[PDB]
């Protein structure tokens, strides 16, 4: 009986948008929603996908969320709210949940997901400077929304959070900071659930269990165990893929890329662009 | 697959 | 006539070729790069990627390419606005192999080519790679039948890749006449648009595009040889045999294979 | 890294 070895494998109905710029903690929230809706801990990615639609995925097959749902329908997107596809849901939209996150952390998260290691000085510097230059990820023609459909960060934020009585006349809108969720997951997630109004009293015990089911640790297990995908273990080098569930850090310094990059970032933060305005508004500007 | 341990 | 003209087909059925001929005809200019083709007709799936969509109330003839089955929800938006469906069909043997080549799978990589053929056969198409395509029979059926239902205001024409290959001028003339792109159709210009779009011109278009990055058709060459009824025997007789079995039943696959002269 | 195990 020796231990410590490793195994040898060799409106009540209507659309609820879960909208966010890439890397703002959208999947975590959807995981908590799935856990909460089903009262079961999600085990693989498909358990998460089973309880909320992804617009861009659906579009890939010519599919669309129902334009007249007879139930609450959760739909994720990173697309700007003013893309023509979203205009089909002007009236059918009942809730907008918009998740925002520190652009520093979105930048670094996106970088990892682009398979750029902080060891690759040239590629990581290039990536970070493009992000700053473009006020976000809408330069990446290969990323979500083809870049253009995503917009820069301020463009995305503005589209989802402003003039909501115009775009979605029948919807309530709630903006939630990733950082606030990290701070007090149970309190903030219960606010999300109450806001989405999926029906009936929010049981704080159900909320607590849903949060417990969706911690970084549980979601790391989910990633390894999956099953589906976030978008055949140990093939060769080329089979490696960036870790989807990372550390979920806050206000990361860009200094490790070079103090000049950090300085460029600060220049951006304290300028007069929409980027700086939103960073200030959401407490990301210091 | 998906293992693992620690025995 | 205002309204959408769909250029619909299962993948690898000669869609880009027809679009090239259309661009040459509409502009009266031989396409030199991919962008000259893409300038003249929209691609549904490319647009959706941006959350964009063809106009639901078009005030002019609008050409749109898609590989999706006609019955997916997105196509449902265009029930009224659809004026013409041009559907291109091609021998599935050749779609299979063209698709296999474009997936950068070599004919002598026994395991990957075999696996690819098996999946094509098991799934009766390429709808596993996505479900929006459907199987070949599902796609063919969706576009060519019950069109009075899906697109109540549209006429439908189906053309075989192989017939286009056999007599480009006669066949493209029929396409242009059908699509109703305004004014009588001058045979000289059908001839000129066909000449601008031969395999040779398109290989040149491919090269030229590559030296300018003047677009992309979606590294395997997009413009190949356009072979017909290729044997799958090289993949193995069990696989050729499995394929033939598809042709010899009374399934939808067999029905359309027979119908379009692909059943041997 | 990015691939799992264990072997
Ligand atoms: N259970 C979780 N709790 C907190 N953050 C999480 C969780 N799961 C994923 N995330 C984070 O959410 C980010 C990915 O967000 P999206 O799902 O919007 O893409 C990642 O952040 P990081 O790269 O900075 O670590 C990811 O790690
Ligand atoms: N000018 C052309 N004439 C005939 N066939 C063509 C032409 N251009 C492209 N094709 C063929 O059309 C096929 C690709 O069609 P798509 O619908 O993807 O466009 C390819 O066939 P192959 O791989 O079997 O060769 C491509 O070669
Ligand atoms: Cl073991």
For the residues of chain C, what is the DSSP string, one character each? --EEEEEEESTTSSHHHHHHHHHHHHHSS---SHHHHHTTSEEHHHHHTTT----SS-SSEEEEEE-S-TTSHHHHTTTTTEEEEEEEE--HHHHHHHHHHHTT--TT-HHHHHHHHHHHHHHTSSTT--TTT--HHHHHHHHHSSHHHHSTT-EEEEEEHHHHHH-HHHHHHHHHHHHT-SSPPPHHHHHHHHHTTSHHHHHHHHHHHHHHT--------SS-----S---GGG-HHHHHHHHHHHHSSSHHHHHHHHTT---
Q: Which atom of ligand 1 is nearest to the CA of A249?
A: 24
At residue C163, φ and ψ (nearest 5 deg) are -75, -35
Q: Which of A63, A84, A148 sits opposite C53 (nearest CB)?
A: A84
At residue A176, φ and ψ (nearest 5 deg) are -130, 125
Residues linked to residue C84 through DSSP beta bridges, in sequence order: C5, C155
Say how far apart CA A20 and CA A98 lie, in whole Å. Answer: 6
Q: Which ligand is nearest to the CA of A2?
A: 3
Contacts of A257 by beta carbon, 8 Å cutoff, 6+ apart: A118, A121, A124, A125, A128
In the DSSP assignment, the letter for residue B6 is: E
Which residues of chain A make contact with B1, given a CB cutoff of 8 A?
A: 9, 233
Taking CA–CA distances from A239, the nearest residue in chain D reads D3
Angstrom CA distances, A62 to A143, C45, C134, C223, stand at 19, 8, 11, 27
From the CB of residue A161, how many other CB atoms can be counted at a distance below 10 Å? Answer: 19
Measured in residues, chain D has a length of 7
C→A interface, C-beta within 8 Å: 44-45, 48-53, 66, 68-69, 72-75, 77, 130-132
Resolution (A): 2.0
A residues 226-245 lying closer than 8 A (beta carbon) to D: 233-235, 239-243
Q: Which of C127, C140, C124, C103 is nearest to C8 (CA)?
A: C140
Q: Which residue is associated with the tokens 């969720």?
A: A181
Say how far apart CA C80 and CA C152 lie, in whole Å. Answer: 7
Structure tokens at C134: 């459907």
Structure tokens at A223: 């990633």
Method: X-ray
Say how far apart CA A49 and CA A71 lie, in whole Å. Answer: 17
Using the mean position of ligand 1's atoms as its centre, give its distance from the Cα of residue D2 in Å: 16
Whole-number CA gyration radius for chain D: 6
What domains appear along chain A, each with residue ranges and CATH number?
Answer: 1-101+152-239 (3.40.50.300), 102-151+240-286 (1.25.40.460)
Contacts of A208 by beta carbon, 8 Å cutoff, 6+ apart: A186
Burial C141-170 (b: 16+ CB within 10 A, else e): bbbbeebeebbeebbbebbbbbbbeeebee
Q: What is the 3-state secondary structure (H, E, C) of chain A?
A: CCCCEECCCCCCCEEEEEEECCCCCHHHHHHHHHHHHHCCCCCCHHHHHCCCEEHHHHHCCCCCCCCCCCCEEEEEECCCCCCCCHHHHCCCEEEEEEEECCHHHHHHHHHHHCCCCCCCHHHHHHHHHHHHHHCCCCCCCCCHHHCCCCCCHHHHHHHHHCCHHHHCCCCEEEEEEHHHHHHCHHHHHHHHHHHHCCCCCCCHHHHHHHHHCCCHHHHHHHHHHCCCCCCCCCCCHHHCCCCCCCCCCCCCCCHHHCHHHHHHHHHHHCCCCHHHHHHHHCCCCC
Instruction: Give the gap in angstroms from C-alpha B6 to the nearest C-alpha of chain D.
Output: 11
Positive or negative, the Cα torsion across A52, A54, A58, A59? positive
Instruction: Give the gap in angstroms from C-alpha A200 to the nearest C-alpha of chain D.
Output: 41
Contacts of A171 by beta carbon, 8 Å cutoff, 6+ apart: A11, A14, A93, A94, A95, A96, A164
Residues linked to residue A73 through DSSP beta bridges, in sequence order: A15
Q: Which residue is associated with the tokens 């590294």?
A: C219
């Amino acid at each position: 009986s020796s231990h410590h070895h490793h195994h040898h494998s060799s409106s009540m109905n209507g659309i609820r948008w879960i909208a966010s710029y890439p890397k703002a903690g959208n999947t975590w929230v959807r995981c908590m929603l799935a856990a909460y809706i089903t009262g079961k801990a999600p085990q693989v990615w498909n358990d998460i996908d089973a309880e909320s639609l992804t617009l861009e995925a659906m579009l890939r097959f010519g599919d669309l969320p129902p334009a007249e749902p007879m139930e609450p329908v959760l739909v994720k997107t990173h697309l700007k709210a003013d893309v023509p596809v979203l205009g089909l849901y002007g009236e059918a939209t009942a809730k907008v949940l918009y998740l925002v996150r520190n652009p520093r952390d979105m930048l670094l998260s996106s970088m990892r997901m682009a398979s750029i290691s902080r060891d690759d000085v040239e590629k990581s510097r290039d990536f970070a400077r493009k992000f700053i230059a473009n006020e976000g990820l809408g330069w990446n023609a290969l990323g979500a929304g083809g870049g253009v459909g995503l917009g820069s960060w301020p463009e995305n934020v503005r589209s989802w959070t402003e003039s909501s009585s115009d775009r979605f006349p029948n919807a309530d809108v709630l903006t939630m900071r990733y950082e606030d969720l990290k701070g007090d997951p149970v309190a903030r997630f219960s606010e999300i659930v109450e806001f989405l109004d999926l029906g009936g009293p929010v049981d704080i015990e159900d909320i607590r269990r849903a949060v417990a089911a969706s911690t970084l640790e549980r979601m790391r297990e989910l990633e390894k165990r999956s099953g589906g995908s976030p978008i055949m273990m140990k093939g060769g080098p080329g089979g490696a893929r960036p870790q989807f569930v990372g550390e979920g850090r806050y206000d990361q310094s860009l200094s490790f890329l070079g103090e000049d990059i950090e300085s460029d970032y600060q220049e951006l933060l304290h300028g007069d662009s929409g980027f700086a305005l939103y960073a200030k508004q959401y407490g990301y500007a210091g | 697959x998906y293992x693992x341990x620690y025995x």
